[PDB]
């Protein structure tokens, strides 16, 4: 079928990649359109596969620009310093989605989590199934990778998503677990894997010498 | 007449004068054009004098931009990263074509050749009017001028263009002459004098203690 | 026995070791000596293993100093800014002879040879039992190791000592052999292999279209 390959992921405080492949070239139209994370889809553009035909979009003109590779099937649209963008074709329609292509508009540096956790053993006053959890803090870029005991623990495992701090571009996420209360010989280790900065994080608490 | 001086040649891996002289100048519009290296024409542009009105082709408006100088009456087209250039006038005709300024798409650098010639005395088997030549390989930037015994041997003399070389963007030219087997006390010297590089080579071969 | 280990050969534009061995030490007297190439033996100094009695050479106390080690039975002698050096005991006698240590007062930089052989085929005027040899010219440091086609050809070999240039501090060699003049078809490679410059050259010479 019509199928694509988009690439790839970067962070920039700039070309994407768009490559046509399994049909004939030349028969529909790269068309490039974004969406601002949690939100709606914004239409950027068309080109034809015969001319580079701009109609760009009023408010993309200037940042987006897309340009042609007839030759070899792909399509290239470049920009200038925040989304996940996306080329489609048959220009009336939308049916030839491709892959999804995350930019961010970023000036942070590649770190690693500074995980501050609570694992108590389900004892931090009288519940039977109390709480646990890390706080996966300070990384870029995204994401992390969270497992329990190496994945051991699944049941009540809730992964939050990143929130993005406004202090220095560093997201935070946290991964929490309810374990009961009859569990207090079990450790629960959160193993954070932040990959782009290759980052291996495993966590626990414990008491203050309770009563 | 009508006379242009265009310049010049350059090496990127880009701003081209047209200076129009010998008539009044708001007469006539300058008009872009330019051939790839063994291909057709491709028109570029045609700017008013008066003004800057681009009107340019639909493939040529992202990479090349023309600009006007209507005080002095020099024109300039401007270029981002491999062929001749012409600027003409009288868009309707194209009667006043100017001087031919060759841009290269180039990555190499300026280099001498290395001949690797053979210049046997027509005495590799039997042959009466056998063959020699020398083989000038790796240089950058174009051309080499290449002379038989500082210019003497001019008959026979066939240079071959520089065939550009997918290795290292080094292009390849070898000059052949045709002497006669009753010649054998007769070196040739191509005299290769590649001058961007100004290196001077010159050459000859001999045998292999034969019989 | 007593044996000695000296260390090591050096270019200075400076310890020298002296490893005693195989016997008991505090027992004979560390004398350093030294010899300048092609010259006679200039005595240095004598220290006891016990203390740093000094008692160098009137000529030699500034430039070299003579240090003890004497719990790991080493000793050293320090030189600041030409020949060959020695480590002797038995300060009466001179029986214990040390290895042998050459430094060089360099400034040169270490580099390959650049042989500008004869190697004809005995064929050069008329002579029967004629000549050839390699000009192994411009290396740095010492020395070259040169083999006539990988060391076949050993009769007639007569290879020169490094005579030292006044140009460059760069010593220059010839090794010479004397084949016959019925061995024309027969090529005679030196192969000059400078090790401490890591290069290994390989030459033979034609001759020039005779009759």
């Known amino acids: 079928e019509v199928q694509l390959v988009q690439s790839g992921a970067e962070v920039k405080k700039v070309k994407v990649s768009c490559?046509?492949?399994?049909?004939?070239?030349?028969?529909?139209?790269?068309?490039?359109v974004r969406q601002a994370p949690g939100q709606g889809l914004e239409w950027?553009?068309?080109?034809?596969?015969?001319?580079?035909?701009?109609?760009?979009?009023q408010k993309f003109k200037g940042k987006a620009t897309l340009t042609v590779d007839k030759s070899t099937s792909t399509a290239y649209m470049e920009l200038s310093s925040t989304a996940v963008?996306?080329?489609?074709?048959?220009?009336?329609?939308?049916?030839?989605?491709?892959?999804g292509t995350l930019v961010t508009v970023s000036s942070a540096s590649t770190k690693g989590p500074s995980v501050f956790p609570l694992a108590p053993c389900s004892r931090s006053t009288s519940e039977s199934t109390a709480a646990l959890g890390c706080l996966v803090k300070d990384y870029f870029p995204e994401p992390v990778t969270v497992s329990w005991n190496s994945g051991a623990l699944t049941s009540g495992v809730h992964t939050f998503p990143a929130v993005l701090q406004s202090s220095g571009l560093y997201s935070l996420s946290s991964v929490v677990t309810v374990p009961s209360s009859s569990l207090g010989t079990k450790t629960y280790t959160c193993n954070v894997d932040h990959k782009p900065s290759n980052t291996k994080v495993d966590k626990r608490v414990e008491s203050k010498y309770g009563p | 007449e009508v006379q242009l001086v265009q310049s010049g040649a350059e090496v990127k891996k880009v701003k081209v004068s047209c200076?129009?002289?010998?008539?009044?100048?708001?007469?006539?519009?300058?008009?872009?054009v330019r051939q790839a290296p063994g291909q057709g024409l491709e028109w570029?542009?045609?700017?008013?004098?008066?003004?800057?009105?681009?009107?340019?082709?639909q493939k040529f408006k992202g990479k090349a931009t023309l600009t006007v100088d209507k005080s002095t009456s020099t024109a300039y087209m401007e270029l981002s990263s491999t062929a001749v250039?012409?600027?003409?006038?009288?868009?309707?005709?194209?009667?006043?074509?100017?001087?031919g300024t060759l841009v290269t798409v180039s990555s190499a650098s300026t280099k001498g050749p290395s001949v690797f010639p053979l210049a046997p005395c027509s005495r590799s088997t039997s042959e009466s009017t056998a063959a020699l030549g020398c083989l000038v390989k790796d240089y950058f930037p174009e051309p080499v001028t290449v002379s038989w015994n500082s210019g003497a041997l001019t008959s026979g003399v066939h240079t071959f263009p520089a065939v550009l070389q997918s290795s290292g963007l080094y292009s390849l030219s070898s000059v052949v002459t045709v002497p006669s087997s009753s010649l054998g006390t007769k070196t040739y010297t191509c005299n290769v004098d590649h001058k961007p590089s100004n290196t001077k080579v010159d050459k000859r071969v001999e045998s292999k203690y034969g019989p | 026995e007593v044996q000695l280990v000296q260390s090591g050969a050096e270019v200075k534009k400076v310890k020298v070791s002296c490893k005693a061995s195989?016997?008991?030490?505090?027992?004979?007297?560390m004398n350093w000596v030294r010899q300048a190439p092609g010259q006679g033996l200039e005595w240095i100094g004598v220290?006891?293993?016990?203390?740093?009695?000094?008692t160098y050479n009137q000529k030699f106390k500034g430039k070299a100093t003579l240090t003890v080690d004497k719990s790991t039975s080493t000793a050293y002698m320090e030189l600041s800014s030409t020949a060959v050096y020695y480590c002797?005991?038995?300060?009466?006698?001179?029986?214990?002879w040390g290895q042998g240590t050459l430094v060089t007062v360099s400034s040169a930089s270490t580099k390959g040879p650049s042989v500008f052989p004869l190697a004809p085929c005995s064929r050069s005027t008329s002579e029967s039992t004629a000549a050839l040899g390699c000009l192994v010219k411009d290396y740095f440091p010492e020395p070259v190791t040169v083999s006539w086609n990988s060391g076949a050809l050993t009769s007639g070999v007569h290879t020169f000592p490094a005579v030292l240039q006044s140009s460059g501090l760069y010593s220059l060699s010839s090794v010479v052999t004397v084949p016959s003049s019925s061995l024309g078809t027969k090529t005679y490679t030196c192969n000059v292999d400078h090790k401490p410059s890591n290069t290994k050259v390989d030459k033979r010479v034609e001759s020039k279209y005779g009759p």
């Open positions: 002797v005991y038995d300060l009466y006698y001179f029986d214990y």
């Open positions: 195989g016997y008991t030490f505090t027992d004979y007297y």
């Open positions: 220290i006891s293993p016990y203390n740093g009695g000094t």
